[PDB]
Design a protein around this ligand. Structure first.
Ligand SMILES: NCC1=CC([N+](=O)[O-])C=CC1=O
Lengths: 237, 300
């Protein structure tokens, strides 16, 4: 059924699974019109489909042209997400297809179930976890490829860089969610923490800087300090 | 007018005949029901006084044979049987009629209720939902499951309603996922009406039969079916105009007849609020919306 803290280790077992987050699929700016009305302008978006065990990220870029002439875009965005996830699963070899797809928002359940009718053995599940995947667009190289796209495009990343050479997928996922939670709560300060030392650089083929084990402990501590600092500023604590 | 005579009433029982009911005492000199209107299906149903478990009954049509009830003390129920000797059947009934041992079907002349509840119900369609081919009448009870219920267990004793499932390949054309899930017109008009039922009269017949089994037996899978068939129409943007007008009449008389005190168990809040207030056809059920609002405003 739903996925929560009680079955958290299930994420890192050997059954292929994907998280699907649709937050960044339909993105708009809201502005006044010359006549003093309000209008939206869409910008490029993305589906965030992630294997939490391997770090493989299937980033489908949603180009603004897919919205042209369409109505009820927030509803259509869920069905377009489900369409694209279904197409991804069909494109994968059988032995690579997931056994479960976990959606981060419950409104994706029916659209994805209907698009996956042909896959009765793939479980579509919600989660009680509050996962910060909306912050994916705070990762500079992911934001860059989304905004520069001129047509629909799929780009593949490993969101863990080379961390699994040294840590488990449980620890890698925890690091990821802490980094994304910090970028979601205070993006400027989080990026400041990440690029504070010029000596540590982001490899051309990576998303995050090349921290040693000891530096990652320091970084993780500063991210937690950031989240607690913001929690205190928020609630006056 | 036709007659369902009873050999005896050895156990105390509440007898229903269509929407009417009356109590018979243990060993009371009761020998059946006369003046049953020809031209409609009917249902004669039972609830034992000493064990309200298992409401059960028989759907029949007096144009199809001579049927009577005799208690079976082995299986512990009132059974319908067919008398093929017509001369014998007439004499046993005339004797019962002369000794005034029968109740009269108490139809008021003004009263079209039973016609309005059974307008599209035919015996031949009942006999395909309830498969027991050696009898001309059909047994239904409180506990019989539906084929769809059994899929989610004795198939010989099931209610073979048409399976409706909004998240199934039957309901959803590949490539029209969003379209077909948000607008059920394809599923309603092509799969169900053109494909399975052949016409709206057969669709309404099954709908009306499902309601009646829900109301008279408390059959839960029948209530599920009734609501599903309502929702499938209301959730379709394209429905023939005569179908919506007829649906409003059908539903109005069902809601009018429902016992007020069974509303909590026989009515699905989600379906009705969706159908009356959110669906494509939210404005097409004026009569049903008015009686629902005046009679069951809590549900809404
Ligand atoms: N088994 C005797 C018999 C009784 C009866 N009755 O009581 O109504 C009708 C038909 C019949 O065959």
């Amino acid at each position: 059924g739903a996925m929560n803290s009680s079955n958290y280790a299930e994420l890192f077992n050997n059954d292929i699974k994907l998280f699907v987050d649709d937050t960044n699929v339909y993105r708009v700016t809201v502005h006044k019109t010359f006549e003093g009305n309000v209008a939206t302008k869409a910008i490029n978006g993305c589906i965030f489909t992630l294997n939490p065990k391997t770090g493989h990220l299937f980033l489908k870029i949603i180009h603004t042209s897919v919205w042209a002439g369409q109505k009820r875009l927030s509803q259509l965005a869920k069905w377009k997400t489900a369409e694209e996830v279904s197409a991804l699963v069909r494109s994968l070899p059988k032995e690579e297809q997931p056994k479960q797809i976990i959606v981060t928002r419950k409104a994706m359940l029916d659209p994805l179930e209907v698009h996956m009718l042909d896959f009765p053995n793939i479980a579509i599940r919600p989660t009680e976890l509050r996962l910060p995947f909306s912050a994916a667009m705070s990762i500079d190289k992911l934001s860059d490829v989304v905004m520069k796209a001129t047509e629909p495009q799929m780009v593949l990343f490993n969101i863990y860089d080379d961390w699994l050479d040294r840590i488990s997928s449980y620890t890698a996922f925890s690091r990821l969610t802490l980094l994304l939670r910090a970028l979601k709560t205070n993006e400027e300060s989080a990026k400041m923490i990440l690029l504070s030392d010029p000596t540590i650089t982001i490899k051309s083929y990576h998303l995050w800087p090349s921290f040693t084990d000891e530096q990652w402990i320091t970084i993780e501590s500063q991210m937690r300090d950031l989240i607690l600092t913001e929690y205190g500023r928020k609630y006056n604590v | 007018m036709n007659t369902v005579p009873f050999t005896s009433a050895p156990i105390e029982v509440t007898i229903g005949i269509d929407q009417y009911s009356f109590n018979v005492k243990e060993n009371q000199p009761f020998h059946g029901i006369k003046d049953i209107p020809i031209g409609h299906v009917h249902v004669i149903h039972f609830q034992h006084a000493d064990n309200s478990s298992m409401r059960y009954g028989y759907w029949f049509d007096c144009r199809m044979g001579n049927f009577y009830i005799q208690y079976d003390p082995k299986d512990g129920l009132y059974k319908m049987m067919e008398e093929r000797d017509g001369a014998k059947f007439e004499n046993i009934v005339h004797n019962f009629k002369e000794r005034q041992m029968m109740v009269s079907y108490p139809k008021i002349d003004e009263d079209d209720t039973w016609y309005n509840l059974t307008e599209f119900v035919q015996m031949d369609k009942i006999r395909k939902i309830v498969r027991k081919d050696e009898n001309q009448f059909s047994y239904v009870d409180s506990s019989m499951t539906t084929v769809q219920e059994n899929e989610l267990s004795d198939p010989a004793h099931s209610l073979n309603y048409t399976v409706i499932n909004f998240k199934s390949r039957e309901a959803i054309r590949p490539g029209h996922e969003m379209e077909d899930f948000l607008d059920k017109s394809y599923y309603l008009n092509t799969v169900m009406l053109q494909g399975i039922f052949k016409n709206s009269s057969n669709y309404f017949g099954e709908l009306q039969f499902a309601f009646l089994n829900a109301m008279f037996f408390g059959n839960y899978g029948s209530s599920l079916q009734w609501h599903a068939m309502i929702e499938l129409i209301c959730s379709s943007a394209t429905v023939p105009k005569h179908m919506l007008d007829k649906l409003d009449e059908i539903l109005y008389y069902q809601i009018k007849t429902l016992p007020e005190q069974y509303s909590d168990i026989l009515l699905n809040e989600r379906v009705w609020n969706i159908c009356l207030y959110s669906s494509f056809q939210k404005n097409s059920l004026h009569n049903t919306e008015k009686i629902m609002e005046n009679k069951y405003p809590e549900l809404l």
